[PDB]
């Protein structure tokens, strides 16, 4: 009622999802048990905190009309032992008298944590009774009538038994809200509040939202508000709280003044981003461009003809060459053309001494690639990871844990039904032929160095956000620039930018004598011996390279 | 409600402790007879939801007599005595009900052991239970009083148990098999409407790796649903009067309710007889013949050459270059000679757990015992067999497990048709400490393939791939020597890809094909 589904935003196919999952029992339960089937006891859900499940809960309670009857994660621990088992319990059993109930509770991994994890035994008691209670759920008098509901960010610290059959099966996750989403929740959030907004600049607004949950959506409206109050407040010294609370009226600036004030909460969890970058920034090279969709394209409807052609369809596409040199660039391009979704762990991040917590996050970011199945896994630098075990004592053993952890996720390939993964690095010599092992990653690239036309494309992207002057000549640039980075020849060219602008603090211009004296001052930091190491590799890896 | 047909599988024990059960009973004269004490307690173990609670009810409903299930935790009441004097009364109505018996579940929680039980009435509870047991012992009581049991695991049991008169019968269940599966499968479906075919559920069966009874029961419940989401998605608008009895299961309904199942295989021991076989990869008869001499003559040949008993040696170590399809071969002899293959595998095996390790190997052989017509196995052992000493963050537990993995294995005569097979590709790297003879003897040596290799893992390719004819399998030959069978089956999947690549819609892998996949391949034989 005061908590109905038109007052929550995104999550519209988990909405759909639970909708389902309860409804029909709790409106048809007889046409449940006539069946002879069972009704599920509960569900949990799970999502990093912050989007507050708890909306949700009271939301589908106060819907459906059932006898709400809530508890939280810390707050019913209490100093008592047992007790609070006999709290639970009467509040089991006063709910089965009004059969139409739901019990939920939020951090359930607080009141039953893991069991090794736990020192007192007392809270391993209260895990018993509350197994024993949940049996009470799978009782004949009330079958599947007491739900219960749980709700915690942790699915592994979870206790193991709570996860076997009729305790704890349908797992609903609800991750970090999506750009789209993020806009969906924060119009529904803003519904009734005065402002002068333009949805265009609005979705401006939320893809300004990364790393942003909802809970601190509702912050920035109350702050934005507050710091309107402030301006017209800062226009007009001592007006009647009436006339002035007659006036408000909250705009972009609004919002933009608001945004740097407080910090997004989550920015830890891999969320599913969507590409932003395009193919328009990009010098060129379709035909790799080309390689690339067919490649990741094949394994989706040529099926029918591999099998034909009796032979085990390949899936790890890899990329090799100079670092960043636009790479990367083109690995988030062609996810984007795809259309698809970006989960990126770079390398060395996986560094925490918190030891197999990395293998936990590894862990995860497989369970959402899953999830989210038509989407795309993508590595970067992965000899980070991949420098052999040995030559460190301690920081190996992590790196030995997470690469088998990662071998066991990605050889489970047929699960992987069409989920690509697209890998990329430097020295592709120092990984472990694990990953090479065939039937994982059987497809590569060496991205090419920029020739001519390449060199010519990215000059086009760089004129065309600088007021350049026009003794600008695309023939010599291009030719002292060979032996260099796309990337790193942006740089030359801002240096000259920067060189001119030295010069004279205000001309609008810049001049390629400045430019000839950038590219003096820039070097080379790359050597052909490299182009020769990665030619060699490419011959003598023994491998598809097609 | 519940017949013993009704019970996923597991016949041969059903009717063990069917016979087991009943006999006693029926005859004690049977076992004085031949002067044999009346076996008391019997105890079955194995993963949870097995079957434990299902094997208890059936059997309560098969008895003919008296059965009074207690479940564990339930008497747990921290006052004092009426956890035991209940148990009084429980044996003291076992008395009068003289043909009778009784199980406990759970008994896990009963009795942990002084490191686990971190509470004494545990201790004492369990005196009282030893008590009761040897108390049964009266003569009137005998043939009548039985005992029953079963746990979550046999390992947080206590030694206090198994002592004679109290716990022999330690009868083992756990993951189901093959024809068990499909078995499970028919006797769950035995009264569902399904949409179901025979061959869908041989090759369903064949999708699952780890399930268990009630898992499956779950899985075959949740694609029902699924089914009947589906028909209700159609139209909403249908009250259960019309849809409880059309909905049946297809394929699709298992398939979605299956992909969000994780069938408690995480860490388990699979009997699993393979599908290889020698001519999936011959030649090197020289080899086979030698490995299938040390492991199946110590049997029969050094009996009949006892004459000359110089001595039948139980460990091999048989292995040269890397990539030369060892395990395949040792997956192959073991199918061949019809014995239950196990694995443990070196990097499987590196893992952080201390212990737990070894406890891992301690199952390992003694369900290999179990089954003791069999091969043990182990891949790439030197992974936790490093060069001692070099690694002080991971060698520091390779030697201790070693020192355990040598602690069982030293029953060289424990070893009695049971050999051993580690792995590895570097003979330095193996420590001769663990080659002072008596365990690990034998060594082979397995090389490059050869020629006529070759030419027989190509007709193996060309028989699975459709290639054609105008490539001579002699040019190969001609240019496929100092190669390896994974690099040369690599070799043959890059031409595929190259003809596929080349025409998306060929149908036959032409020279020029080779030819580039020859210029994409090398003899990686560093």
Same mark, same amino acid.
């Given at each position: 009622?005061?908590?109905?589904?038109?007052?929550?935003?995104?999550?519209?196919?988990?909405?759909?999802?639970?909708?389902?999952?309860?409804?029909?029992?709790?409106?048809?339960?007889?046409?449940?048990?006539?069946?002879?089937?069972?009704?599920?006891?509960?569900?949990?859900?799970?999502?990093?905190?912050?989007?507050?499940?708890?909306?949700?809960?009271?939301?589908?309670?106060?819907?459906?009309?059932?006898?709400?009857?809530?508890?939280?994660?810390?707050?019913?621990?209490?100093?008592?032992?047992?007790?609070?088992?006999?709290?639970?319990?009467? %509040?089991?059993?006063?709910?089965?008298?009004?059969?139409?109930?739901?019990?939920?509770?939020?951090?359930?991994?607080?009141?039953?944590?893991?069991?090794?994890?736990?020192?007192?035994?007392?809270?391993?008691?209260?895990?018993?009774?509350?197994?024993?209670?949940?049996?009470?759920?799978?009782?004949?008098?009330?079958?599947?009538?007491?739900?219960?509901?749980?709700?915690?960010?942790?699915?592994?610290?979870?206790?193991?038994?709570?996860?076997?059959?009729?305790?704890?099966?349908?797992?609903?996750?609800?991750?970090?809200?999506?750009?789209?989403?993020?806009?969906?929740?924060?119009?529904?959030?803003?519904?009734?509040?005065?402002?002068?907004?333009?949805?265009?600049?609005?979705?401006?607004?939320?893809?300004?939202?990364?790393?942003?949950?909802?809970?601190?959506?509702?912050?920035?409206?109350?702050?934005?508000?507050?710091?309107?109050?402030?301006?017209?407040?800062?226009?007009q010294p001592n007006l009647p709280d009436v006339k002035v609370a007659g006036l408000v009226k909250i705009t972009l600036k609004d919002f933009l003044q608001a945004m740097n004030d407080i910090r997004p909460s989550a920015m830890r969890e891999i969320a599913i981003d969507v590409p932003n970058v395009s193919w328009s920034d990009i010098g060129g090279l379709e035909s790799i461009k080309l390689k690339l969709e067919q490649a990741v394209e094949w394994?989706?409807?040529?099926?029918?003809?591999? %099998?034909?052609?009796?032979?085990?369809?390949?899936?790890?596409?890899?990329?090799?060459?100079?670092?960043?040199?636009?790479?990367?660039?083109?690995?988030?391009?062609?996810?984007?053309?795809?259309?698809?979704?970006?989960?990126?762990?770079?390398?060395?991040?996986?560094?925490?001494?918190?030891?197999?917590?990395?293998?936990?996050?590894?862990?995860?970011?497989?369970?959402?690639?899953?999830?989210?199945?038509?989407?795309?896994?993508?590595?970067?630098?992965?000899?980070?990871?991949?420098?052999?075990?040995?030559?460190?004592?301690?920081?190996?053993?992590?790196?030995?844990?997470?690469?088998?952890?990662?071998?066991?996720?990605?050889?489970?390939?047929?699960?992987?039904?069409?989920?690509?993964?697209?890998?990329?690095?430097?020295?592709?010599?120092?990984?472990?032929?694990?990953?090479?092992?065939?039937?994982?990653?059987?497809?590569?690239?060496?991205?090419?160095?920029?020739?001519?036309?390449?060199?010519?494309?990215?000059?086009?992207?760089?004129?065309?956000?600088?007021?350049?002057?026009?003794?600008?000549?695309?023939?010599?640039?291009?030719?002292?620039?060979?032996?260099?980075?796309?990337?790193?020849?942006?740089?030359?060219?801002?240096?000259?930018?920067?060189?001119?602008?030295?010069?004279?603090?205000?001309?609008?211009?810049?001049?390629?004598?400045?430019?000839?004296?950038?590219?003096?001052?820039?070097?080379?930091?790359?050597?052909?011996?490299?182009?020769?190491?990665?030619?060699?590799?490419?011959?003598?890896?023994?491998?598809?390279?097609?």
């Open positions: 009622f005061k908590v109905t589904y038109d007052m929550i935003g995104g999550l519209s196919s988990q909405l759909k999802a639970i909708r389902e999952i309860i409804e029909l029992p709790l409106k048809q339960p007889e046409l449940f048990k006539s069946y002879g089937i069972p009704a599920p006891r509960g569900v949990l859900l799970y999502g990093p905190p912050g989007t507050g499940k708890t909306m949700i809960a009271r939301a589908v309670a106060n819907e459906v009309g059932a006898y709400v009857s809530v508890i939280n994660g810390p707050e019913i621990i209490s100093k008592f032992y047992g007790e609070t088992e006999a709290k639970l319990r009467q %509040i089991f059993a006063e709910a089965t008298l009004r059969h139409p109930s739901i019990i939920f509770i939020d951090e359930l991994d607080a009141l039953c944590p893991k069991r090794e994890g736990a020192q007192n035994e007392v809270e391993k008691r209260v895990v018993a009774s509350l197994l024993t209670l949940m049996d009470g759920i799978g009782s004949e008098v009330s079958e599947g009538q007491v739900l219960v509901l749980g709700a915690t960010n942790r699915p592994h610290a979870l206790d193991a038994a709570l996860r076997r059959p009729g305790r704890f099966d349908k797992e609903i996750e609800i991750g970090v809200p999506n750009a789209q989403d993020r806009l969906d929740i924060l119009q529904k959030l803003l519904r009734r509040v005065p402002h002068l907004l333009t949805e265009a600049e609005l979705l401006q607004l939320a893809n300004s939202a990364h790393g942003y949950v909802g809970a601190d959506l509702k912050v920035l409206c109350n702050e934005a508000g507050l710091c309107a109050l402030r301006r017209i407040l800062k226009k394994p989706l409807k040529h099926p029918e003809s591999f %099998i034909r052609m009796g032979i085990q369809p390949p899936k790890g596409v890899l990329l090799y060459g100079p670092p960043g040199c636009s790479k990367t660039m083109i690995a988030k391009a062609l996810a984007n053309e795809s259309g698809l979704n970006f989960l990126a762990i770079k390398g060395p991040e996986l560094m925490n001494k918190y030891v197999g917590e990395s293998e936990r996050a590894v862990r995860e970011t497989f369970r959402k690639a899953r999830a989210v199945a038509p989407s795309i896994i993508f590595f970067d630098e992965l000899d980070a990871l991949a420098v052999e075990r040995g030559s460190s004592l301690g920081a190996g053993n992590v790196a030995d844990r997470v690469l088998a952890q990662l071998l066991t996720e990605m050889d489970g390939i047929e699960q992987l039904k069409d989920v690509t993964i697209l890998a990329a690095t430097n020295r592709p010599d120092r990984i472990d032929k694990a990953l090479m092992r065939p039937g994982r990653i059987d497809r590569i690239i060496y991205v090419p160095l920029p020739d001519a036309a390449t060199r010519r494309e990215i000059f086009k992207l760089q004129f065309h956000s600088m007021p350049v002057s026009n003794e600008v000549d695309l023939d010599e640039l291009i030719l002292q620039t060979d032996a260099y980075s796309g990337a790193e020849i942006v740089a030359v060219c801002r240096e000259a930018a920067l060189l001119a602008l030295e010069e004279d603090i205000q001309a609008n211009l810049i001049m390629k004598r400045h430019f000839t004296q950038a590219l003096s001052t820039v070097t080379p930091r790359i050597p052909e011996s490299l182009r020769r190491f990665y030619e060699d590799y490419q011959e003598k890896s023994g491998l598809h390279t097609l």
